[PDB]
Amino acid sequence: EFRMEKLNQLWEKAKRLHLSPVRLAELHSDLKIQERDELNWKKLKVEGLDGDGEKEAKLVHNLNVILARYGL
């Protein structure tokens, strides 16, 4: 269903939490937009073109506040 191993894990576990559909739907929209963010992070990581690693902090803090915001 979703690209990264962790997003599928969050998606099954979010369903295991029986969260409200509107909250559960907003999870994917925040994770799926992060899916495009993590792809460009992962391209610039293995190619080493991200010399400063700017793309890692903005995805890590976003995932942490996603976990806190949606009750996980």
Added chain:
Amino acid sequence: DEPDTCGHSVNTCRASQFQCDNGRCISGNWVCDGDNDCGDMSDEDQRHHCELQNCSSTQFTCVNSRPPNRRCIPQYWVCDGDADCSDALDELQNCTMRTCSAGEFSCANGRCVRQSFRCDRRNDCGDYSDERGCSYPPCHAN
């Protein structure tokens, strides 16, 4: 980019990176993580990589499991409110909590789950106590 800037079939992906689908080649570690990177998603399979996994700090491994379920979870889910591993070993650990009431079905191993999670298609309790002895009514017409 994809329709006409290059020959479709004139030459392969270059040997700097590893072929995994005719439409996609893959860099290194990405073949082993469980992500849908190769675009047919067949990276973690065939015979090249990841029969096993190993966990870093703040992660724990579901040792009694197979590739179809799971083999590493963070501490963020150990002894939490919901089972994660294949056999739900994450919730047993050294925790072994007591409190359980008539409002939830009681398993043999001591863990409890909601009554709706009895006699169904899912291994909810890890011990399969929620499934043993059940009598499934027949399926619908469709």
